[PDB]
Amino acid sequence: NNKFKVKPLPYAYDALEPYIDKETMKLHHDKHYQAYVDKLNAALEKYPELYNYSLCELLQNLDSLPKDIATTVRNNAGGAYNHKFFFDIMTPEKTIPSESLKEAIDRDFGSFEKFKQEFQKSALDVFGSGWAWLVATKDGKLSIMTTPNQDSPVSKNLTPIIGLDVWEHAYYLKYQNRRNEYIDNWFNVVNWNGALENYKNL
């Protein structure tokens, strides 16, 4: 069976409390993430050879896929990729920026504090559903950008280092309309070691 799979949550559903509630983690992972994978797999039944692409390859080739599934794949491979990434980039363990990522952040933003302010603002200003991202060019240059819906920096040949889901389903149960509190709290669970790995893998 070479269909796409939901990656099991890498920690307990209540591991990110009190920053993200257990109920949200259950819905977010077991309903939302699950639905993107299911829909992706269903769309691909017509072209089974596409099961042999990685999520990245699908996302890097949206404009050359068969016209009749291009949009579905964009949305659902996007959802599948983004959520796998998002759950991996959070952790109950305490982590901090180190090594080349730590240096790159200081270099490209001036300081970690300045980077964090810019990131929070970009995340706050996303209008509608979307994501805020710290991304790297192939040469390791860092910047912050956002994508709408389940669109991914990957489709623009940018490499995601960290990323924050600001779809309302990611924060509404606990924060309601207060996305700023969500964004601020989320920095307590960012997995900086996983971010470092993402940056090294360029």
User: Residue numbers of the site for Mn ion (CB under 5 A)?
Assistant: 165, 167, 170
Residue of 7, 32, 102, 116 that binds its own copies (CB under 8 A): 32
Cα 152 from Cα 88, distance rounded (Å)? 16
35 binds its own copies (CB under 8 A): yes
Nearest approach in angstroms of CB 169 to its own copies is 5
- Tell me if 83 is assigned to a ligand binding site: yes
60 binds its own copies (CB under 8 A): no
- Structure tokens belonging to residue 28: 């977010």
Residue of 60, 61, 75, 100 that binds its own copies (CB under 8 A): 75
* Cβ distance to its own copies smaller for residue 115 or 186: 186
27 binds its own copies (CB under 8 A): yes
Spatial contact of 62 and 43, defined as CB atoms under 8 Å apart: no
Cα 150 from Cα 77, distance rounded (Å)? 8
Cα 188 from Cα 64, distance rounded (Å)? 40
177 binds, among Mn ion, its own copies, none (CB under 5 to 8 A by kind): its own copies
Q: Of 167-186, which residues contact its own copies (CB under 8 A)?
A: 167-169, 172-173, 176-177
165 binds, among its own copies, Mn ion, none (CB under 5 to 8 A by kind): Mn ion
Give the burial class of 64: count Cβ atoms within 10 A of its Cβ; 0-12 exposed, 13-18 middle, 19 or more buried: exposed
Close Cβ partners of 10 (under 8 Å, ≥ 6 residues apart): 87, 88, 91
Cα 85 from Cα 163, distance rounded (Å)? 8
Nearest approach in angstroms of CB 149 to its own copies is 4
The annotation places the binding site for Fe(3+) at 28, 83, 165, 169
